[PDB]
């Protein structure tokens, strides 16, 4: 289609005394999980997590298994290095994380690339939007920025995201055999005072990118909306709600607006018995 993405999520969690770290990679095309590696098996393999990946040749799985084990090893070494860099005692449990990936528009060129790491759940180092320079999050990471600049690592990470990532994204999207439009309702709820909550629901939509906004008299709100982050419904679709507090009797001065890739035009709706 038009806007698409391929993203990988890497996590290692150490456990001194018990064994080597547990390392996991999870891949997503758009908002759908499609592959996974988990080092906590005897002979762990790169595996499909969707129907349209199950017919892919063995060589793809083998190659990505070896790349995943290499990443396991990198994460194991980085966890040790990070203990030194942050002057931490041994014996505790720690995490190392990486997220990378690409977004493309309709032309198949890279719109936006990502390459960033975290230690114990905190920013460590990230490739900037230019895919040319790094931002170190603290003094500890400043040495990594220096090493990676001297080695020219941004160029290689750049080349991956501009080439391999975007091209395999294109391949994955030809696999198998589409957008799910949201269905919206507005519910009304009582409160102690002479006011009422209007909750605007969007259900059954894919992909997850959506915009729910309320308006008063066709203009921007003065109050702040309450909302929940977009969330999986358990069948590969997503839901969201946004809400507003309004005077009892003035409900219909407020309108909910829903923007989604699937819709021909935005939905407009207001409370209605």
């Amino acid at each position: 289609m038009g806007p698409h993405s391929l993203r990988y999520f890497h996590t290692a969690v150490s456990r001194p005394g018990l064994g080597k770290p547990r390392f996991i990679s999870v891949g997503y095309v758009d908002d759908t999980q499609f592959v996974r590696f988990d080092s906590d098996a005897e002979n762990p393999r790169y595996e499909p997590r969707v129907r349209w990946m199950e017919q892919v040749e063995p060589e793809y799985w083998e190659r990505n298994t070896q790349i995943a084990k290499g990443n396991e090893q990198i994460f194991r070494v980085n966890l040790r290095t990070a203990l030194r860099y942050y002057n931490q005692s041994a014996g505790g449990s720690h995490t190392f994380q990486r997220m990378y990936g690409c977004e493309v528009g309709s032309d198949w060129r890279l719109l936006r690339g990502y390459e960033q790491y975290a230690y114990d759940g905190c920013d460590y180092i990230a490739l900037n939007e230019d895919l040319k320079t790094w931002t170190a999050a603290d003094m500890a990471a400043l040495i990594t920025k220096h090493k990676w600049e001297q080695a020219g690592d941004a160029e290689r990470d750049r080349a991956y995201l501009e080439g391999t990532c975007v091209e395999w994204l294109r391949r994955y999207l030809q696999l198998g055999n589409r957008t799910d439009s949201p269905k919206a309702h507005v519910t009304r709820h009582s409160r102690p005072e002479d006011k009422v909550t209007l909750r605007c629901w969007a259900l059954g939509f894919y992909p997850a990118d959506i915009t729910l906004t309320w308006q008063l008299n066709g203009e921007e709100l003065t109050q702040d909306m309450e909302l929940v982050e977009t969330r999986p419904a358990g069948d590969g679709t997503f839901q969201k709600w946004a809400s507003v507090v309004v005077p009892l009797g003035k409900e219909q001065y407020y309108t909910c607006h829903v923007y989604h890739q699937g819709l021909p035009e935005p939905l407009t709706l207001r409370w209605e018995p």
């Binding site: 891949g27 790349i67 990443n71 990198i74 994460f75 980085n78 290095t81 990486r98 990594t144 991956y160």
Partner: peptide
């Protein structure tokens, strides 16, 4: 198709 990480 996955990329190699980097050593910090």
């Amino acid at each position: 198709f996955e990329a190699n990480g980097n050593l910090i």
